[PDB]
Motif scaffolding. Structure first.
Motif, PDB file in Angstrom:
ATOM      1  N   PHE A  71      -7.635  -9.532   1.092  1.00  0.00           N
ATOM      2  CA  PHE A  71      -8.628  -8.641   0.517  1.00  0.00           C
ATOM      3  C   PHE A  71      -8.073  -7.234   0.400  1.00  0.00           C
ATOM      4  CE2 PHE A  71     -11.015 -12.100   2.297  1.00  0.00           C
ATOM      5  CZ  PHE A  71     -11.893 -12.397   1.274  1.00  0.00           C
ATOM      6  N   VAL A  72      -8.342  -6.611  -0.739  1.00  0.00           N
ATOM      7  CA  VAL A  72      -7.849  -5.270  -1.016  1.00  0.00           C
ATOM      8  C   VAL A  72      -8.743  -4.262  -0.314  1.00  0.00           C
ATOM      9  CG1 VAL A  72      -7.165  -3.668  -2.820  1.00  0.00           C
ATOM     10  CG2 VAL A  72      -7.061  -6.135  -3.236  1.00  0.00           C
ATOM     11  N   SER A  73      -8.135  -3.389   0.478  1.00  0.00           N
ATOM     12  CA  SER A  73      -8.834  -2.303   1.146  1.00  0.00           C
ATOM     13  C   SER A  73      -8.217  -0.983   0.713  1.00  0.00           C
ATOM     14  CB  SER A  73      -8.762  -2.452   2.666  1.00  0.00           C
ATOM     15  OG  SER A  73      -9.199  -3.739   3.065  1.00  0.00           O
ATOM     16  N   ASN A  99       0.618  -5.904   1.512  1.00  0.00           N
ATOM     17  CA  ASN A  99       1.269  -5.419   0.306  1.00  0.00           C
ATOM     18  C   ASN A  99       0.623  -4.110  -0.123  1.00  0.00           C
ATOM     19  OD1 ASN A  99       0.141  -5.813  -2.861  1.00  0.00           O
ATOM     20  ND2 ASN A  99       2.320  -5.344  -2.628  1.00  0.00           N
ATOM     21  N   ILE A 100       1.449  -3.173  -0.580  1.00  0.00           N
ATOM     22  CA  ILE A 100       0.998  -1.857  -1.006  1.00  0.00           C
ATOM     23  C   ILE A 100       1.245  -1.712  -2.499  1.00  0.00           C
ATOM     24  CG2 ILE A 100       1.144   0.617  -0.623  1.00  0.00           C
ATOM     25  CD1 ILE A 100       2.195   0.139   2.092  1.00  0.00           C
ATOM     26  N   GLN A 101       0.216  -1.290  -3.223  1.00  0.00           N
ATOM     27  CA  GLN A 101       0.338  -0.870  -4.610  1.00  0.00           C
ATOM     28  C   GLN A 101       0.050   0.621  -4.684  1.00  0.00           C
ATOM     29  OE1 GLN A 101       1.231  -2.736  -7.212  1.00  0.00           O
ATOM     30  NE2 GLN A 101       0.883  -4.870  -6.609  1.00  0.00           N
ATOM     31  N   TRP A 102       0.955   1.379  -5.300  1.00  0.00           N
ATOM     32  CA  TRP A 102       0.822   2.834  -5.298  1.00  0.00           C
ATOM     33  C   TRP A 102       1.491   3.423  -6.528  1.00  0.00           C
ATOM     34  CZ3 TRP A 102       4.314   7.044  -4.612  1.00  0.00           C
ATOM     35  CH2 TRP A 102       3.673   8.275  -4.439  1.00  0.00           C
ATOM     36  N   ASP A 103       0.688   3.852  -7.493  1.00  0.00           N
ATOM     37  CA  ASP A 103       1.214   4.724  -8.526  1.00  0.00           C
ATOM     38  C   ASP A 103       1.513   6.093  -7.928  1.00  0.00           C
ATOM     39  OD1 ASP A 103      -1.546   4.312  -8.210  1.00  0.00           O
ATOM     40  OD2 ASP A 103      -1.964   5.757  -9.812  1.00  0.00           O
ATOM     41  N   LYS A 104       2.421   6.814  -8.585  1.00  0.00           N
ATOM     42  CA  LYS A 104       3.066   7.965  -7.960  1.00  0.00           C
ATOM     43  C   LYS A 104       2.132   9.159  -7.802  1.00  0.00           C
ATOM     44  CE  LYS A 104       6.877   6.112  -7.015  1.00  0.00           C
ATOM     45  NZ  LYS A 104       6.772   4.741  -6.457  1.00  0.00           N
ATOM     46  N   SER A 106      -1.174   8.979  -7.355  1.00  0.00           N
ATOM     47  CA  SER A 106      -2.420   8.590  -6.719  1.00  0.00           C
ATOM     48  C   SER A 106      -2.498   9.108  -5.288  1.00  0.00           C
ATOM     49  CB  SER A 106      -2.569   7.070  -6.725  1.00  0.00           C
ATOM     50  OG  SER A 106      -1.362   6.437  -6.341  1.00  0.00           O
ATOM     51  N   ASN A 107      -3.717   9.102  -4.752  1.00  0.00           N
ATOM     52  CA  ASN A 107      -3.945   9.350  -3.339  1.00  0.00           C
ATOM     53  C   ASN A 107      -4.706   8.218  -2.671  1.00  0.00           C
ATOM     54  OD1 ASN A 107      -6.630   9.989  -4.366  1.00  0.00           O
ATOM     55  ND2 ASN A 107      -6.973  11.050  -2.415  1.00  0.00           N
ATOM     56  N   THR A 108      -5.023   7.156  -3.402  1.00  0.00           N
ATOM     57  CA  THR A 108      -5.744   6.017  -2.857  1.00  0.00           C
ATOM     58  C   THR A 108      -4.780   4.853  -2.704  1.00  0.00           C
ATOM     59  OG1 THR A 108      -7.680   6.804  -4.065  1.00  0.00           O
ATOM     60  CG2 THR A 108      -7.822   4.633  -3.046  1.00  0.00           C
ATOM     61  N   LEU A 109      -4.782   4.252  -1.522  1.00  0.00           N
ATOM     62  CA  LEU A 109      -3.844   3.202  -1.161  1.00  0.00           C
ATOM     63  C   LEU A 109      -4.559   1.871  -1.009  1.00  0.00           C
ATOM     64  CD1 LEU A 109      -1.421   4.993   1.241  1.00  0.00           C
ATOM     65  CD2 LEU A 109      -0.886   3.778  -0.867  1.00  0.00           C
ATOM     66  N   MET A 110      -3.876   0.801  -1.403  1.00  0.00           N
ATOM     67  CA  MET A 110      -4.421  -0.547  -1.371  1.00  0.00           C
ATOM     68  C   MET A 110      -3.629  -1.402  -0.393  1.00  0.00           C
ATOM     69  SD  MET A 110      -6.707   0.203  -3.314  1.00  0.00           S
ATOM     70  CE  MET A 110      -7.156   1.269  -4.681  1.00  0.00           C
ATOM     71  N   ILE A 111      -4.344  -2.079   0.499  1.00  0.00           N
ATOM     72  CA  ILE A 111      -3.749  -2.938   1.515  1.00  0.00           C
ATOM     73  C   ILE A 111      -4.366  -4.319   1.374  1.00  0.00           C
ATOM     74  CG2 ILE A 111      -3.437  -3.346   3.981  1.00  0.00           C
ATOM     75  CD1 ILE A 111      -4.290   0.144   3.003  1.00  0.00           C
ATOM     76  N   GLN A 112      -3.521  -5.342   1.284  1.00  0.00           N
ATOM     77  CA  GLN A 112      -3.972  -6.720   1.108  1.00  0.00           C
ATOM     78  C   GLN A 112      -3.291  -7.579   2.161  1.00  0.00           C
ATOM     79  OE1 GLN A 112      -4.024  -5.021  -1.952  1.00  0.00           O
ATOM     80  NE2 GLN A 112      -1.838  -4.597  -2.232  1.00  0.00           N
ATOM     81  N   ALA A 113      -4.052  -7.986   3.171  1.00  0.00           N
ATOM     82  CA  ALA A 113      -3.481  -8.666   4.322  1.00  0.00           C
ATOM     83  C   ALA A 113      -3.189 -10.128   4.014  1.00  0.00           C
ATOM     84  CB  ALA A 113      -4.418  -8.565   5.524  1.00  0.00           C
ATOM     85  N   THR A 114      -2.189 -10.669   4.714  1.00  0.00           N
ATOM     86  CA  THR A 114      -1.798 -12.064   4.570  1.00  0.00           C
ATOM     87  C   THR A 114      -1.986 -12.880   5.837  1.00  0.00           C
ATOM     88  OG1 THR A 114       0.066 -10.949   3.497  1.00  0.00           O
ATOM     89  CG2 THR A 114      -0.129 -13.329   3.178  1.00  0.00           C
ATOM     90  N   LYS A 115      -2.056 -12.239   6.990  1.00  0.00           N
ATOM     91  CA  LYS A 115      -2.260 -12.919   8.254  1.00  0.00           C
ATOM     92  C   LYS A 115      -3.617 -12.519   8.821  1.00  0.00           C
ATOM     93  CE  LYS A 115       2.590 -12.207   8.271  1.00  0.00           C
ATOM     94  NZ  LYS A 115       3.560 -11.101   8.505  1.00  0.00           N
ATOM     95  N   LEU A 116      -3.953 -13.090   9.975  1.00  0.00           N
ATOM     96  CA  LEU A 116      -5.263 -12.886  10.582  1.00  0.00           C
ATOM     97  C   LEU A 116      -5.226 -11.952  11.782  1.00  0.00           C
ATOM     98  CD1 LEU A 116      -6.763 -16.476  10.478  1.00  0.00           C
ATOM     99  CD2 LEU A 116      -7.215 -14.556   8.951  1.00  0.00           C
ATOM    100  N   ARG A 147     -13.441   0.992   1.805  1.00  0.00           N
ATOM    101  CA  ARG A 147     -12.999   2.332   1.435  1.00  0.00           C
ATOM    102  C   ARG A 147     -13.081   3.230   2.657  1.00  0.00           C
ATOM    103  NH1 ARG A 147     -15.512   6.797  -0.977  1.00  0.00           N
ATOM    104  NH2 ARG A 147     -17.406   5.569  -0.602  1.00  0.00           N
ATOM    105  N   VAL A 148     -11.926   3.666   3.143  1.00  0.00           N
ATOM    106  CA  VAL A 148     -11.842   4.591   4.264  1.00  0.00           C
ATOM    107  C   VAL A 148     -11.559   5.973   3.693  1.00  0.00           C
ATOM    108  CG1 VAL A 148     -10.734   5.128   6.444  1.00  0.00           C
ATOM    109  CG2 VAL A 148     -11.017   2.747   5.746  1.00  0.00           C
ATOM    110  N   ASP A 149     -12.546   6.857   3.787  1.00  0.00           N
ATOM    111  CA  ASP A 149     -12.427   8.225   3.299  1.00  0.00           C
ATOM    112  C   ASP A 149     -12.070   9.112   4.483  1.00  0.00           C
ATOM    113  OD1 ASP A 149     -13.829   6.526   1.626  1.00  0.00           O
ATOM    114  OD2 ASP A 149     -15.712   7.621   1.854  1.00  0.00           O
TER     115      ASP A 149
END
Lengths: 242, 34, 63, 52, 34, 34, 34, 63, 63, 63
Positions: A71-73, A99-104, A106-116, A147-149
């Motif tokens: 899930f993307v956080s 996994n991290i997706q980050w355009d250069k 941006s200030n918002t980061l995406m985290i997608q977990a694979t384990k528990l 969304r963690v602000d």
């Protein structure tokens, strides 16, 4: 010819060994099987969005980030003024788990977990932050923060309610009072009634009033039990109860 | 009695022949021009 | 009060909206206004039985 | 639905059916549409996205 | 007693024929214009 | 009690398939355009 | 009593499986930005 | 008074926020202001047994 | 009042059309105003049976 | 009286054109103006059995 008819019957039987009723039966059985396949134990965490304030003290404990597998956080960073602050660099321990997706820019980061139950750590450097940002990323929890602000101590390159109550959002800290007589909505938070309607008041008055493009109106008014309403040359009354 | 199986086996092939003939349906043809 | 409908019926969690559009999500054991606490969630057939013996279901037209 | 961006707001849930196209149109407070810039989809095994 | 299993032989294949027909799902298509 | 070990074998094959189905999780995508 | 070592056999194979799972640690990644 | 909510349930340690919003983290045998010492911490069902014999949980609505 | 006809019949769901633009879909347990409740839906031969005993049918010339 | 002649004959549907050029199609259980109900449709020989005890038939020369 009864031999030929019997031959037709048995060739139909061996050609289609399953009745349509059993076909629907096994289709339902397949539905139960795939539902048990998709069935997951326990209960899912409640999807939430939260705001926390980071601390740059040496004795300050670093924040944790709730994760769920697959899930993307999102993490979004605001300064002391709340303005966004873009990122310069980041480094994440164990990129197998996430996994991290980050355009250069941006200030918002995406985290997608694979384990528990495999947790990691992350360091972030913004566009002006001399100090690093140290985060502990933890999956396997009963609550998920989408969304963690995060409010920060520094400042980056950058440093009302009538609109909400005309759109239809009830004001915070309020309760909707029962209004007798006709279609209107009203709320009371700090003993100032906020009224959302499409009618015009004549006798009690108002202090500020917005209107919308479609024609509805939002009034703010000191409360009084009796209200006078004009509508197309008609005069009617409204009663509200304290 | 016992000579009914070959009376079934021949037309079993033809029955399986007929269903796939009923099974397929072609697409259309669209044309233009002036 | 507020009449609550069912939005998403799954095992574990549940999603509800109110009569006024008040969106929310619940677990198995939690308190709701006007009905007590939720004591049973049935993933089959989409009914929720509260501690007050009251039933949360879908809309009649939007069932 | 009105999407509320406050942290107390519960996230919206879209009921879907398998292999049927669902339309998601995003507008402002006044109804003026907001075009999309980027999106993140975790697990596209379960979903398909066609995006102009 | 002895006819039961060979009766189930073709039927189990028929269900195995049936069981994968719901697994595949075609995706969307899209077209534009001007 | 050969039915016991045969049932254990087929259920074990199905369960090994099930746990290697539980194990894998694909990644995400990220798409933009301007 | 031949059951002594067969339960040892599948014991060690998962044990030899499990030990190298903790052995490997990938290094972290780094990304700049402009 | 001050009420702590467990914010990251983990084996061994525990991360907590307060009713004031004060953040902290503890281990199994340690001290906690407002409760004294710590008696038992388990990841089972999110229970923290304080020295006062009380069961610290997380927030009620954050479920 | 309003007179309806069946329009499209699938197993499970039914579609009805009135001459006053009232075209909807209904279930087996569904509240049809002026008629009551549906007691039986058959996918074939085009009869929809009401709990008040009415029979909803297709148009015989639009057939 | 209005006289109908057959135009297209298949099992299931039958096409009838009147003296005024009015052409329709009907099933076996049907009700038509000018002849009453429709008793039976024979796809063979182009003959339709009517509720009047008569036979609907195409134009003999226009065939």
């Amino acid at each position: 010819e009864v031999i030929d008819k019997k031959a037709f019957k048995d060739m139909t039987r061996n050609l289609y060994p399953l009745n349509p009723e059993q076909v629907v039966k096994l289709k339902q059985i397949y539905e139960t099987s795939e539902y048990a396949k998709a069935a997951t134990p326990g209960t899912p965490p409640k999807p939430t969005a939260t705001s926390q304030f980071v601390n740059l003290s040496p004795g300050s404990t670093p924040p944790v980030i709730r994760l769920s597998q697959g899930f993307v956080s999102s993490l979004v960073f605001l300064d002391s003024t709340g303005a966004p602050w873009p990122i310069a660099a980041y480094d994440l321990g164990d990129p197998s788990s996430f996994n991290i997706q980050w355009d250069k820019t941006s200030n918002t980061l995406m985290i997608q977990a694979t384990k528990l139950y495999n947790y990691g750590n992350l360091a972030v450097r913004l566009r002006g932050l001399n100090t690093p940002v140290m985060l502990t990323l933890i999956p396997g929890q009963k609550a998920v923060d989408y969304r963690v602000d995060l409010r920060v101590q520094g400042y980056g390159p950058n440093a009302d309610l009538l609109l909400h109550v005309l759109e239809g959002v009830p004001p915070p800290g309020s309760r909707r009072l029962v209004v007798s007589g006709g279609d209107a909505r009203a709320w009371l938070s700090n003993e100032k009634m906020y009224v959302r309607t499409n009618l015009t008041i004549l006798s009690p008055g108002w202090l500020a009033s917005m209107t919308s493009a479609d024609g509805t109106h939002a009034y703010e008014m000191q409360k009084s039990p009796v209200l006078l309403v004009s509508w197309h040359g008609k005069v009617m009354q409204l009663k509200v109860e304290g | 009695q016992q000579e009914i199986q070959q009376r079934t086996s021949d037309m079993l092939t033809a029955a399986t022949q007929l269903v796939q003939d009923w099974k397929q349906v072609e697409t259309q043809v669209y044309t233009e021009g002036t | 009060r507020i009449i609550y409908y069912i939005q998403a019926v799954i095992p574990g969690r549940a999603w509800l909206i109110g009569s006024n559009g008040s969106t929310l999500t619940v677990r198995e054991g939690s308190k709701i206004p006007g009905y007590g606490m939720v004591k049973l969630i049935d993933s089959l057939q989409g009914r929720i039985l509260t501690s007050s013996g009251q039933v949360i279901k879908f809309s009649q037209e939007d069932s």
